[PDB]
Amino acid sequence: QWALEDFEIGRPLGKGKFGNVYLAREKQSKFILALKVLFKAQLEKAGVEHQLRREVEIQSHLRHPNILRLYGYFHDATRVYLILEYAPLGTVYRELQKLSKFDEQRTATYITELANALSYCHSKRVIHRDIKPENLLLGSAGELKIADFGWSVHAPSSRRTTLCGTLDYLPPEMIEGRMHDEKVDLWSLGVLCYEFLVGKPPFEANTYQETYKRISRVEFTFPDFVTEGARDLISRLLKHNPSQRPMLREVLEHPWITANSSK
Ligand SMILES: Nc1ncnc2c1ncn2[C@@H]1O[C@H](COP(=O)(O)OP(=O)(O)O)[C@@H](O)[C@H]1O
Ligand SMILES: O=C(O)c1cc(O)cc(-c2ccc(OC(F)(F)F)cc2)c1
Ligand SMILES: [Mg+2]
Ligand SMILES: [Mg+2]
């Protein structure tokens, strides 16, 4: 049972669609953590309260080295605060802006830590449904951590996520409002793997309608530098039919993954 007075607040860490996440330290400990702030009026006006409940219940009951930790929460008259584990190395979005592209070793390592975290989620029938570079955080030893369980749910489901957000990481069945399962996170894993190596997602366009067309028709091409081992993995993950998508153990055991991942 914490309160705002139990914390010393520092600089902002990142911007959220419902308030910023700030760097903070607990007075009696000097322990460094992140405080996600959400404004009540915005939650109420949007009708996000039920999804915020799912975010807090699901995330707090997960324990994995590649998943961000949710310690607890508290609220006042105008805001809701989420006590998060601090990720010292920032996002994989920022790391991708610095390094225009990632090499095969970085990608295979990140995809390995990502598949390991998703298997733990999928073992509890939990699906993230919002895997994008801004929600992938780098912990103390440079390891990946899955954050923002804002759209996480228990499989199966049909709930609409982005009304007009980034469609780039969403599978065809999600953008079309169809029934979806664990296979949605496998599509996001392929888009992520393509983006890590190329610099941009495979269905990127300057119009929501063109992106919709390109993802529903699976219209993408690989630039010259993409290796046959990466081309195979990406093409296996990015299939229209969710049943034709591989299992997480086949991604972890893929020849191109095992040849470039850091044990
Ligand atoms: N634990 C954390 N450590 C460091 N930065 C974080 C942490 N949690 C969030 N951030 C930063 O805050 C941004 C928004 O946080 P996020 O939880 O994704 O909120 P929203 O769901 O509102 O988008 C992230 O993209 C990242 O830059
Ligand atoms: O008490 C209030 O006035 C209020 C107002 C609001 O808009 C949202 C919430 C709220 C939602 C989820 C939550 O986390 C959960 F309880 F689900 F874990 C904790 C507080 C509380
Ligand atoms: Mg986010
Ligand atoms: Mg969110």
Author numbering: 127 to 389
Kindly provide excerpts from the paper associated with this entry.
Crucially, we were also able to obtain crystal structures of some of these hits in complex with the Aurora A protein, enabling a structure-based drug design. A representative of such fragment is compound 2, a biphenyl molecule bearing a carboxylic acid and a phenol group on one ring and a lipophilic trifluoromethoxy group on the other. Compound 2 has a KD of 63 μM as measured by our competitive FP assay and a KD of 145 μM as determined by ITC. The binding of 2 to Aurora A, as determined by X-ray crystallography, alongside some key structural motifs showing both the ATP site and TPX2 peptide binding sites, is highlighted in Figure 2. Our ligand-observed Carr-Purcell-Meiboom-Gill (CPMG) NMR experiments and FP studies showed that these fragments are competitive with the TPX2 peptide, and X-ray crystallography revealed that the hit fragments bind to part of the TPX2 binding site, normally occupied by the Tyr8 and Tyr10 of TPX2. An overlay of the crystal structures of early hit 2 with CAM2602 bound to Aurora A reveals a remarkable overlap of the core biaryl scaffold in the two compounds.
Aurora A is a serine/threonine protein kinase that plays an important role in controlling early stages of mitosis, including centrosome maturation and separation, mitotic entry, and bipolar spindle formation. Localization and enzymatic activity of Aurora A are regulated by its interaction with the spindle assembly factor TPX2. We have used fragment-based, structure-guided lead discovery to develop small molecule inhibitors of the Aurora A-TPX2 protein–protein interaction (PPI). The initial fragment hits identified from screening with the ATP site blocked by a high-affinity inhibitor were very weakly active, but guided by continuous crystallographic analysis of the inhibitors in complex with Aurora A, we were able to increase target affinity by more than 10,000-fold, clearly demonstrating the ability of fragment-based and structural biology approaches to develop potent PPI inhibitors when a suitable binding pocket is present. These compounds occupy a hydrophobic pocket on the surface of Aurora A, discrete from its ATP-binding catalytic site, which forms the interaction surface for a linear N-terminal segment of the interacting peptide from TPX2.
